[PDB]
A paper describes a structure:
The S. marcescens Rap proteins represent founder members of a new bacterial protein family, members of which represent immunity proteins for T6-secreted toxins, as exemplified by Rap1a and Rap2a. The Rap subunit is constructed around a helical bundle of five helices (α2–α6). The Rap proteins display an extensive dimerization interface, consistent with the observation that each Rap protein exists as a stable dimer in solution.
Well-ordered crystals of Rap1b and Rap2b were obtained and the structures were elucidated at 1.9 Å and 2.0 Å resolution respectively. Rap2b has two dimers, formed by subunits A : B and C : D, in the asymmetric unit. A disulphide linkage (Cys54–Cys120 in Rap1b, Cys41–Cys101 in Rap2b) tethers α2 and α5 together. The Rap1b dimer uses almost 24% of the accessible surface area of a subunit in formation of the dimer. Surprisingly for proteins with such low pI values, the striking surface feature conserved in Rap1b and Rap2b structures is a crescent-shaped basic patch on either side of the dimer. It is possible that such a basic crescent, if present on toxin-binding Rap proteins, may contribute to orientation of the partner during binding; conversely, it might contribute to the lack of Ssp binding by Rap1b and Rap2b. Additionally, Rap2b shares slightly higher sequence identity with Rap2a (23% identity for the mature proteins) than it does with Rap1b (20% identity).
Author numbering:
A (entry chain A): 20 to 119
B (entry chain D): 18 to 119
Write the structure that this text describes.
């Protein structure tokens, strides 16, 4: 696990941290929330980014947790909102600001 | 409409990987609400995929096995969220994708 995590780029660790945080902040389930948050903590430990990437990323993760996208078909799409952080330009611009 | 407008610029591979992760989240969670959310999400990605259905029957297997991976972290508890996100960078996800695109 330590092995697979060490294979990830810094951009991937960050995106995974963002998605994980968003899942935890959106989910109804305390079980799932603490799974999501434990998972976010694992990515965070390996990041070489400074703390402000994560203070700014947390607000983005929360904004995506609350986006409440509606699709054709009634119901929540939080999983989709949270996964969109894998490829969202807002996530990439915070990452770019703090990585070089 | 706007959701698909928003997914239409995503690559076929990124659509497939998000479907995988979404299925994996749904299968691993013990909350029926999180499960239905994840499954509804998965279907949105499915809708824009041009892959044959064999890619999704093979991918479902992969997703359920990642949902049952049960990695242990340095803290006590499940890491299903991390196991499902690992499908975004898994060799297997990419090779299955390639096998059914061309």
């Amino acid at each position: 696990m330590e092995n697979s995590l060490n294979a990830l780029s810094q951009e991937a660790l960050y995106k995974n941290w963002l998605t994980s945080r968003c899942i935890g902040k959106s989910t109804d389930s305390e079980r799932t929330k603490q799974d999501a948050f434990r998972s976010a903590s694992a990515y965070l430990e390996l990041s070489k980014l400074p703390m402000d990437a994560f203070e700014q990323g947390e607000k983005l993760a929360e904004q995506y947790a609350n986006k409440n996208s509606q699709g054709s078909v009634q119901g929540t799409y939080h999983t989709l909102d949270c996964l969109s952080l894998q490829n969202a330009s807002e996530a990439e611009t915070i990452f770019e600001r703090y990585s070089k």
